[PDB]
Ligand binder design. Structure first.
Ligand SMILES: OC[C@H]1O[C@@H]([Se][C@@H]2O[C@H](CO)[C@H](O)[C@H](O)[C@H]2O)[C@H](O)[C@@H](O)[C@H]1O
Ligand SMILES: [Cl-]
Length: 139
């Protein structure tokens, strides 16, 4: 069944438009956080961070970390995750943005702040999940 969390998925030669990343898992009961970290070495090109309790609200925080400094957050109040339930996250790399769908519904787009797509060569998956599968394909 499981993969180990935190999990590091290599993206050989980085990301490219038409690359589809699929993450299957189950949110733990009483989850606090999920994080996907697309990394360019020490930098986080794209941090996708559902928070289950931020001041008693559920919010998705997206950001970029450059030279160990976080940038301007992009916050999404649409929250498709539920504690205890199975999910599917799909991240489709497009020319201008990452497109995220959860459970086959469009959730958000994140404009590319890191422009060297071919150097975004690691996805880190962490937080309060049982991880089932993490894979990529070209569509
Ligand atoms: O932006 C994304 C980052 O956010 C920080 Se928390 C962050 O702290 C800021 C003050 O340093 C502001 O309060 C932001 O609102 C808060 O989300 C998290 O510790 C980090 O893991 C990451 O998710
Ligand atoms: Cl760059």
């Amino acid at each position: 069944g499981p993969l180990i969390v935190p999990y590091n998925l290599p993206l050989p030669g980085g990301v490219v438009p038409r690359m589809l990343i699929t993450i299957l898992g189950t949110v733990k009961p009483n989850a606090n956080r999920i994080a996907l970290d697309f990394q360019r070495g020490n930098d986080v090109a794209f941090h996708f961070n559902p928070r289950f309790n931020e001041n008693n609200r559920r919010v998705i925080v997206c950001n970029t970390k450059l030279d160990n400094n976080w940038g301007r957050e992009e916050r999404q109040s649409v929250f498709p995750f539920e504690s205890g339930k199975p999910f599917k996250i799909q991240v489709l790399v497009e020319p201008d943005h990452f497109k995220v769908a959860v459970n086959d519904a469009h959730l958000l787009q994140y404009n590319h702040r890191v422009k060297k797509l071919n150097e975004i060569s690691k996805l880190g998956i962490s937080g309060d999940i049982d991880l089932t599968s993490a894979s990529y394909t070209m569509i």
